[PDB]
A paper describes a structure:
The cubic crystal crystallized at very high concentrations of salt buffer contains 0.01 M MgCl2, 0.05 M HEPES (pH 7.0), 4.0 M LiCl. After data calculation, the cubic crystal consists only of monomers in the crystal asymmetric unit, while in the spindle shape crystal ORF57-CTD forms a dimer in the crystal asymmetric unit and the resolution was relatively lower. As the cubic crystal crystallized in the buffer which has a very high concentration of the salt, it is possible that the dimer was dissolved into monomers by hydrophobic interactions during crystallization. The monomeric crystal belongs to space group I432 and the final structure was refined at resolution of 3.06 Å with R and Rfree values to 22.5% and 26.9%, respectively. The observed monomer structure revealed that ORF57-CTD consists of 11 α-helixes and two short β-sheets. The structure of monomeric ORF57-CTD forms a globular domain which consisting of bundle of 11 α-helixes connected with unstructured loops of various sizes. The N-terminus is represented by an extended “arm” region lacking any α-helixes, but only two unstable small η-helixes (310-helixes). The electron densities for residues V168-R189 and P211-D220 and S455 are not visible in the monomeric structure. The two monomers in the dimeric structure are nearly identical, and the root-mean-square deviation (RMSD) of atomic positions is only 0.528 Å when superimposed, but the N-terminus of the monomeric ORF57-CTD in dimer extends out to a different direction from the N-terminus of monomer if superimposed.
KSHV encoded multifunctional protein ORF57 plays a key role in promoting viral mRNA accumulation and translation. Previous biochemical studies showed that ORF57 is stabilized by dimerization, which is critical for its function. ORF57 comprises of two domains with distinct putative structures: the highly disordered N-terminal domain (NTD) from residue 1 to 166, and the helix-rich C-terminal domain (CTD) from residue 167 to 455. Each monomer contains a zinc ion chelated by four residues, the cysteines at the position 333, 427, 432, and the histidine at 423, which form a consensus zinc-binding motif.
Author numbering: 189 to 210, 221 to 454
Write the structure that this text describes.
């Protein structure tokens, strides 16, 4: 007797056990210039919020902005979904912060982390399509949407079309809400071109986002499909999509 059910064997590997969560940014500048495990780039929502003035004078400083922006886009062009989910996390948590402090998405003046939201978003979704979406999503109604939101963003501009498409749909299933979080900073940055119902969706996703949510949703989605998907190629593609999580040269922090 035993019962192998009470073991979360579906949870996969575990390199860090769950640990319960309870003025200098040069270490964050130096994290940006190197690839590292995310646990080495990690930081707390409230640590960043304490460091807003200072990290703001860094990301909006003119010196090397051209390099950090190209460098981030270079990583995101070659990174897998672990890199890109890391970038999406960093920018979602950064935005949420600058807003709380009275900032806004004004394309005039450059913010390193923000000036790449749309590039990073395009890159993630383009990599999402490397999955066997058909195997993953299941419900035909959900897969139908997800596949289309991925079609528009991945091919061409068409960001407004994908933002608008999401505003119409109810996002009570994980795959769509994920992609919504991905587009939330492209969404806000495109606020005066999208449907009012989009404008409201992305606004709320932004204010209701907590720093784990994107790497979380991506994790549990991939995790639970592969508790049953015995398919050899679907698993092989899932592995290709998320490459090294240690390929993040442009990333300044991984938020929590
Ligand atoms: Zn599968």
């Amino acid at each position: 007797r035993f019962d192998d059910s009470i073991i979360p064997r579906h949870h996969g590997a575990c390199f860090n056990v769950f640990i319960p969560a309870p003025r200098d940014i040069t270490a964050l500048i130096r994290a940006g210039g190197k690839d590292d495990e995310l646990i080495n780039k990690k930081i707390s929502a409230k640590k960043i919020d304490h460091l807003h003035r200072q990290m703001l004078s860094f990301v909006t400083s003119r010196h090397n902005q051209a390099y950090w922006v190209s460098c981030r886009r270079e990583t995101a062009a070659a990174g897998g979904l672990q890199t890109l989910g890391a970038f999406v996390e960093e920018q979602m948590t950064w935005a949420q912060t600058v807003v709380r402090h009275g900032g806004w998405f004004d394309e005039k003046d450059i913010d390193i982390i923000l000036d790449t939201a749309i590039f990073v978003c395009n890159a993630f979704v383009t990599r999402f399509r490397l999955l066997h979406l058909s195997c993953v999503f299941d419900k035909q109604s959900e897969l139908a949407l997800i596949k289309q939101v991925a079609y528009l963003v991945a091919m061409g501009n068409r960001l407004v079309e994908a933002c608008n498409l999401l505003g119409e749909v109810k996002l009570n299933f994980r795959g769509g809400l994920l992609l919504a979080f991905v587009l939330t900073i492209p969404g806000m940055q495109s606020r005066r071109s999208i449907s009012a119902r989009g404008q409201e969706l992305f606004r709320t996703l932004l204010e209701y986002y907590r720093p784990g949510d994107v790497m979380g949703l991506l994790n549990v989605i991939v995790m639970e499909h592969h508790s049953l998907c015995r398919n050899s190629e679907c698993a092989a593609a899932t592995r290709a999509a998320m490459g090294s999580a240690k390929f993040n040269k442009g990333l300044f922090f991984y938020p929590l």
